[PDB]
Design a protein around this nucleic acid. Structure first.
Ligand SMILES: [Mg+2]
Ligand SMILES: [Mg+2]
Ligand SMILES: [Mg+2]
Ligand SMILES: [Mg+2]
Ligand SMILES: [Mg+2]
Ligand SMILES: [Mg+2]
Ligand SMILES: [Mg+2]
Ligand SMILES: [Mg+2]
Ligand SMILES: [Mg+2]
Ligand SMILES: [Mg+2]
Ligand SMILES: [Mg+2]
Ligand SMILES: [Mg+2]
Ligand SMILES: [Mg+2]
Ligand SMILES: [Mg+2]
Ligand SMILES: [Mg+2]
Ligand SMILES: [Mg+2]
Ligand SMILES: [Mg+2]
Ligand SMILES: [Mg+2]
Ligand SMILES: [Mg+2]
Ligand SMILES: [Mg+2]
Ligand SMILES: [Mg+2]
Ligand SMILES: [Mg+2]
Ligand SMILES: [Mg+2]
Ligand SMILES: [Mg+2]
Lengths: 70, 101, 87, 116
RNA sequence: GUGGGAGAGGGUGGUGGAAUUCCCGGAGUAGCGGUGAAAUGCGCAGAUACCGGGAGGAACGCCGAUGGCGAAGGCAGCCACCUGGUCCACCCGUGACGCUGAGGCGCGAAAGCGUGGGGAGCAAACCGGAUUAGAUACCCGGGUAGUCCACGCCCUAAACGAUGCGCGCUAGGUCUCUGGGUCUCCUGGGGGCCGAAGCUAACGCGUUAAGCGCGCCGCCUGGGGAGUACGGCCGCAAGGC
């Protein structure tokens, strides 16, 4: 179980229309992931949520998705 | 005046003429609610996570404007109107806070 | 709401000499502008009480201040009521 | 008598029963069974066993439509979810996937007191 | 003043996806639901289970926290405006302008009230099914006010940290939110846990005091009778003080 902020390129959490970075922060379903498996700090994960929701509204990012295998 | 990012996502299946019509009306009303455009980007037809209007794709543009604050809401409401507009969002613009920190 | 522009036009209006930022008339003036925006924000939006708490805070403070003027200098209080149009 | 090629199967598993509805790749049903469908009546409707037999009679009825391989949607948390899976995959119907669509809301609907 | 913050602090206007219900069509067949076991109930006028579509209300999953905000009550999808409080930096301005606060005034979970809307889920009362000796209940199936919105009243609470506000002094350690700093560390502001001294009836409290002091308000004086009676005041009422 790797760490999904902890290897990636430096960026803007306030950029709501950038998928390729953001969708990395989601899950095997559509859920925004815990600081545990991201590694963003306090302030970080706040802004992250807020923009991820911004994108979800804007259509780019999922509200949900289904677990595969089982 | 204040600085805002205008996101307009519209109906993908507009051919050029239609598309420039909606593109235009966006612009004329934009100009008529007093909103000067500091910048624009048309990133075009991007695909969607969930269907909007059962349409897996939508057509995106963006306008950074300086406009009188009182009217921002109203202006949104005008761009809203069009049937070919799918989604509208005004952001108040932001200095870009930084990541992996 | 209020911008440095406006703020400053007032500061420099009521600065009791050049470079006065925090004097009594000044403080009261800043206060009065705050108060008037708020009051009128409350002329609609009666329904938001919290901000009205704020209104109270402010009217009080400017009233203490002002009293202190009336005490210290009847003259500055006299004409800062001329200007600021209150009490 | 439709000659249905390959397809997809829905396991709906509650606490109180287990139902399997199998449909074409398009979403429209073909055959279905539950524990109530086979013999069982009262609480025994939700046995893991009664579930295996639901999924089993469902795969049989389906097998005779020329159903071949399914994509199995799972919805619900019940006992008898597992026997529903193993029943299918081990019916000789071969399993093309299994999923979880199991819908949970973004908190809109106050539930019955039994559920607070 | 200036510069820099963080936040479910408030109002209004928009608005987004998930789920429930219902209607519409599709395909599909005997059950579904529910329990401790079961019945009531719904089902061949084709339900349950799956797909498509529409309607409408309500609330906001994951982020969410042992977190944050606010004086309290309380505040959680996203946008915009309108606004309150607040923290650190610089040491720029006034020059004690300060603290507390009887009265008065304002706020004030829920329930409840009046008028007018709204009503998807829930659900007192009710209507049934169980269960028991009985069951005016716990369980099951329905359902009305209500829950929602506006305006107006009500003004209660385990309104709990059961701990009034302000300021000063008295070892630390650790986790933490948020600032500033020549950035294992230092330095302010919040929130937690262990603890020096000291306090305590003990339990515990301990730089977020229940320690050492000062100001100022509220308050108590055996239990029941009783938050009752009478009086007054408030309220449409219920009732409140
Ligand atoms: Mg439109
Ligand atoms: Mg049963
Ligand atoms: Mg139908
Ligand atoms: Mg019947
Ligand atoms: Mg509370
Ligand atoms: Mg503010
Ligand atoms: Mg100085
Ligand atoms: Mg001097
Ligand atoms: Mg006071
Ligand atoms: Mg109240
Ligand atoms: Mg209420
Ligand atoms: Mg009412
Ligand atoms: Mg009514
Ligand atoms: Mg009931
Ligand atoms: Mg009900
Ligand atoms: Mg009534
Ligand atoms: Mg108190
Ligand atoms: Mg630092
Ligand atoms: Mg501290
Ligand atoms: Mg302790
Ligand atoms: Mg000791
Ligand atoms: Mg006595
Ligand atoms: Mg009386
Ligand atoms: Mg009367």
């Amino acid at each position: 179980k790797a760490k999904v902020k902890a290897t990636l390129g430096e960026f803007d959490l306030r950029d709501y229309r950038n998928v390729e970075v953001l969708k990395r922060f989601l899950s095997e379903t559509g859920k925004i992931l815990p600081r545990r498996r991201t590694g963003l700090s306090a302030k970080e994960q706040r802004i992250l949520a807020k923009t991820i929701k911004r994108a979800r509204i804007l259509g780019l990012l999922p509200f949900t998705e289904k677990l595969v295998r089982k | 005046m204040r600085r805002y990012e205008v996101n307009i996502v519209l109906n993908p299946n507009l051919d050029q003429s239609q598309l420039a019509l909606e593109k235009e009306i966006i612009q004329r009303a934009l100009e008529n609610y007093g909103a000067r455009v500091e910048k624009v980007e048309e990133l075009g037809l991007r695909r969607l996570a969930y269907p909007i209007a059962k349409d897996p794709q939508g057509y995106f543009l963006w306008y950074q404007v300086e406009m009188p604050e009182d009217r921002v809401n109203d202006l949104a409401r005008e761009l809203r109107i069009r049937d070919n507009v799918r989604r509208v969002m005004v952001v108040k613009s932001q200095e870009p806070f930084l990541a992996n920190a | 709401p209020i911008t440095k522009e406006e703020k400053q036009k007032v500061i420099q209006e009521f600065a009791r000499f050049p470079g006065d930022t925090g004097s009594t008339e000044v403080q009261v003036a800043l206060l009065t502008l705050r108060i008037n925006r708020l009051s009128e924000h409350l002329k609609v939006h009666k329904k938001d009480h919290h901000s009205h708490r704020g209104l109270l805070m402010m009217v009080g403070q400017r009233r203490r201040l002002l009293r202190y003027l009336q005490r210290e200098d009847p003259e500055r209080y006299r004409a800062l009521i001329e200007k600021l149009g209150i009490r | 008598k439709r000659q249905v090629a390959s397809g997809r199967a829905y396991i709906h598993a509650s606490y109180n029963n287990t139902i399997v509805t199998i449909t074409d790749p398009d979403g429209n049903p073909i055959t279905w069974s539950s524990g109530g469908v086979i013999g069982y009546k009262g609480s025994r409707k939700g046995t893991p066993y009664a579930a295996q037999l639901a999924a089993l009679d469902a795969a049989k009825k389906a097998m005779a439509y020329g159903m071949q391989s399914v994509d199995v949607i799972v919805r619900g948390t019940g006992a008898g979810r597992e026997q529903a899976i193993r029943a299918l995959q081990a019916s000789g119907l071969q399993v093309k996937s299994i999923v979880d669509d199991t819908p949970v809301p973004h908190n809109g609907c106050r539930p019955k007191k039994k559920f607070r």
